[PDB]
């Protein structure tokens, strides 16, 4: 009937074809066919990506790969509860008005001028997206930006609007690249290659600090805003109070425990996933301090993502179990050896940067990381490099707003020409490809 | 500071005392102390029961019982995803207006009279609570009941209001006793003793069909309503349409697969948790049919419960690992042998029926089932009997509304005297104790 309902049927037909017409052994054919099915379903977004994540275990069981519980156990990877603690921190610092207070105090650092306010705004937006999200952050900042522009004389001056808006969106999508929380794809990568919070900050904080000013400069040089007015702000200059102090303290304590996870856990007994224990402890300290109630943590969090992680991990453990990964590596050895690694990561990064502009970041990541990682390539291991690269690229969505929630949230204003966004995102995607290639070549090797 | 924040500290002090002043071996002392801590936290409801469920794994790890992942894996017991499919069915049959249509078509079965409408109402409320919930069901039926009574002449006639209302509440709480879904405690019991959907219906459907008419009769004989008026109904006589037909069909197919799980799964390969695969398949069929979107399944479901299941299961696996269960059985052997099993289940059932009137059903169940089951008693195994008994009793909340969501949802009307509810619930709780004792003695043995 509907378009998606026919995409699903075509995908079933393709699955059956590959299940009947492949000259590989049964198990590898099964893995490949499941992979194609799941990819066609995640990219097209026919079924809500979470539903496909839930179908992966069923597709694995009905075909005798996994036992039911051994497949559903992947919906409980410690990384998921780490992300849950992150969502709880977000719910706290939104219910207690902490983010508004931070952004406002920053807007005061700039007395009344714009030339410095939008830059501080991008910076704070990224600092938030480090923890909260990519969507809620943009939604929280949008009214602030509009109140800022309230005295811009928005007539034949749409350029400054587009600047102050796309800067916010991209700053969020980029601050999502600094922490394991902030953007799902980072957590998918870590779960696949076993990375810790700080072991991923060492990859994502420099990358973001490099990609954010590059983006602001590219925008300022593509569109030419004036940025010379003043601030006729009239909202309440909110102040600190109990509940925000405690929330900030617990937030800082959680971050301090995360960053220093290794020495602490080494001086405590050597727990396995100390970061996740720290996140659950953040939840416990926020509850014991009466600063946030579970109903908020439940309305706020996005559990579809917490099921998508499990789906991606079940897919990875499938490709690992049925031996499909080693076969794909044996098959791609020739192509990876003929050319170099630099061109390999170049094509990978461009593919992913131009894919998530049509698909969802989390789905593309969950689908691609397992392959390029579980391959265990021959000419060069680089098993974490590519995972981090893809997780970063999947967040580099800068073209049309259907690619990322924040882009649409900011496009809803009604004065962002699609063509300007598209060309700016093209320039930015090329720049990000180049930058990621450079970093992967120099730093991460 | 606050009452709950001091309860927590007293509980920590008690935990430390038992951790320092018990003449049992270290591990059993640890288990007992964790048990006391968690019980004091779940009964008092200081921290949202979900938060205590989340604290159980941390409390188990920081004290070296479990590895982190081996403890968090219990948040993915197939029973949880079964309950998730149940929540999805509820979201479908609420978003597609199926429940309203069913209740209205039933209200038409009674032409315009009341003497038969309230009984059909209790019946349909139970039939719904079989699947949807105990709370949403009462909330969905309340406006219908008020529109029914709109022509009751509710002056010196509060008796019929209380009847048509408490009947609804108790019918929901009892229909929650027929299926694994419908009430969490049933799922906790099954997870503890490995019960299937039908293997638990064989316990819960007769029990509910017996306890519901008993309750209606007790009410009719305590308070004396008239039940003689007509129906001046004026709402829209809704009709069927596409979306409701498909939803009903998928619902019936899911139920037919659940009930006949054994022969099917035996003629298919012998999967381990076929019921859970069937629930996930229900989600998949509801999504593929474009009848419900994940956002509704996420707003609707109660994930706190899906974490509470994991908390209770981690507690059970703790008491099993540290050897506390066998020790408690060795200690209670004398008391269980001196008296009989009949008196044992009698005291158990009364304790639980009068406990959940102050605590939450799910928490009391999650706390008590592990003990009385993992004991593996000496004089008589009865390892599933007591689990089912406690799961049924925990739903038998009939006194003051703070015990159960539905009771408060119906008390909000503003014309339900606390004393009448309390005495009616006392009578009903005694009757339910007697009935459960009788059934456990005759049928389940």
mmCIF file of C-alpha atoms in Angstrom, chain B residues 11 14 31-45 49-50 52-53 56 59 184-189 191-192 305 307-320 324-325 328 348 351-352 355-356 358-375 386-387 389-391 394:
data_model
loop_
_atom_site.group_PDB
_atom_site.id
_atom_site.type_symbol
_atom_site.label_atom_id
_atom_site.label_comp_id
_atom_site.label_asym_id
_atom_site.label_seq_id
_atom_site.Cartn_x
_atom_site.Cartn_y
_atom_site.Cartn_z
ATOM 1 C CA UNK B 11 18.863 2.684 55.910
ATOM 2 C CA UNK B 14 21.233 -0.151 59.264
ATOM 3 C CA UNK B 31 23.251 -10.518 51.029
ATOM 4 C CA UNK B 32 21.072 -10.027 54.101
ATOM 5 C CA UNK B 33 22.170 -6.416 54.502
ATOM 6 C CA UNK B 34 21.565 -5.610 50.842
ATOM 7 C CA UNK B 35 18.149 -7.224 51.189
ATOM 8 C CA UNK B 36 17.236 -5.107 54.206
ATOM 9 C CA UNK B 37 18.505 -1.943 52.521
ATOM 10 C CA UNK B 38 16.581 -2.570 49.311
ATOM 11 C CA UNK B 39 13.432 -3.544 51.189
ATOM 12 C CA UNK B 40 13.465 -0.440 53.362
ATOM 13 C CA UNK B 41 13.921 1.607 50.199
ATOM 14 C CA UNK B 42 11.196 -0.103 48.163
ATOM 15 C CA UNK B 43 8.514 -0.230 50.856
ATOM 16 C CA UNK B 44 8.993 3.352 52.049
ATOM 17 C CA UNK B 45 9.181 4.477 48.406
ATOM 18 C CA UNK B 49 11.378 2.218 43.020
ATOM 19 C CA UNK B 50 13.116 2.318 39.647
ATOM 20 C CA UNK B 52 16.392 1.489 43.835
ATOM 21 C CA UNK B 53 16.285 -1.120 41.087
ATOM 22 C CA UNK B 56 20.845 -2.853 43.220
ATOM 23 C CA UNK B 59 25.328 -2.198 45.375
ATOM 24 C CA UNK B 184 4.205 -6.464 36.442
ATOM 25 C CA UNK B 185 4.267 -8.805 39.449
ATOM 26 C CA UNK B 186 3.130 -11.653 37.228
ATOM 27 C CA UNK B 187 6.124 -11.089 34.973
ATOM 28 C CA UNK B 188 8.461 -10.883 37.960
ATOM 29 C CA UNK B 189 7.144 -14.223 39.195
ATOM 30 C CA UNK B 191 11.048 -14.529 35.341
ATOM 31 C CA UNK B 192 11.917 -15.918 38.760
ATOM 32 C CA UNK B 305 8.880 -0.956 35.347
ATOM 33 C CA UNK B 307 14.112 -1.360 34.933
ATOM 34 C CA UNK B 308 12.383 -2.577 38.085
ATOM 35 C CA UNK B 309 12.172 -6.068 36.608
ATOM 36 C CA UNK B 310 15.920 -6.024 36.100
ATOM 37 C CA UNK B 311 16.486 -4.755 39.614
ATOM 38 C CA UNK B 312 14.391 -7.509 41.135
ATOM 39 C CA UNK B 313 16.105 -10.117 38.994
ATOM 40 C CA UNK B 314 19.542 -8.848 39.996
ATOM 41 C CA UNK B 315 18.452 -9.071 43.621
ATOM 42 C CA UNK B 316 17.303 -12.649 43.093
ATOM 43 C CA UNK B 317 20.521 -13.625 41.329
ATOM 44 C CA UNK B 318 22.401 -11.991 44.194
ATOM 45 C CA UNK B 319 20.633 -14.018 46.868
ATOM 46 C CA UNK B 320 21.315 -17.042 44.671
ATOM 47 C CA UNK B 324 21.853 -16.376 51.155
ATOM 48 C CA UNK B 325 18.777 -18.239 49.910
ATOM 49 C CA UNK B 328 17.479 -18.631 54.867
ATOM 50 C CA UNK B 348 2.029 -15.086 53.335
ATOM 51 C CA UNK B 351 0.915 -10.245 54.697
ATOM 52 C CA UNK B 352 1.162 -9.371 51.022
ATOM 53 C CA UNK B 355 1.335 -4.764 52.556
ATOM 54 C CA UNK B 356 0.582 -3.503 49.051
ATOM 55 C CA UNK B 358 0.731 0.832 51.888
ATOM 56 C CA UNK B 359 3.460 0.066 49.344
ATOM 57 C CA UNK B 360 3.543 -0.391 45.595
ATOM 58 C CA UNK B 361 2.491 -3.714 44.119
ATOM 59 C CA UNK B 362 5.470 -4.131 41.803
ATOM 60 C CA UNK B 363 8.032 -3.317 44.484
ATOM 61 C CA UNK B 364 6.536 -5.599 47.125
ATOM 62 C CA UNK B 365 6.411 -8.423 44.593
ATOM 63 C CA UNK B 366 9.938 -7.883 43.289
ATOM 64 C CA UNK B 367 11.180 -7.892 46.879
ATOM 65 C CA UNK B 368 9.251 -10.861 48.259
ATOM 66 C CA UNK B 369 9.148 -13.355 45.381
ATOM 67 C CA UNK B 370 12.956 -13.792 45.291
ATOM 68 C CA UNK B 371 13.105 -14.784 48.955
ATOM 69 C CA UNK B 372 10.145 -17.151 49.153
ATOM 70 C CA UNK B 373 11.230 -18.744 45.872
ATOM 71 C CA UNK B 374 15.030 -18.974 46.019
ATOM 72 C CA UNK B 375 14.604 -20.433 49.517
ATOM 73 C CA UNK B 386 4.284 -19.052 46.300
ATOM 74 C CA UNK B 387 5.579 -16.866 43.476
ATOM 75 C CA UNK B 389 0.455 -16.373 45.079
ATOM 76 C CA UNK B 390 2.505 -13.292 45.911
ATOM 77 C CA UNK B 391 2.166 -11.889 42.402
ATOM 78 C CA UNK B 394 0.351 -7.792 45.320
#
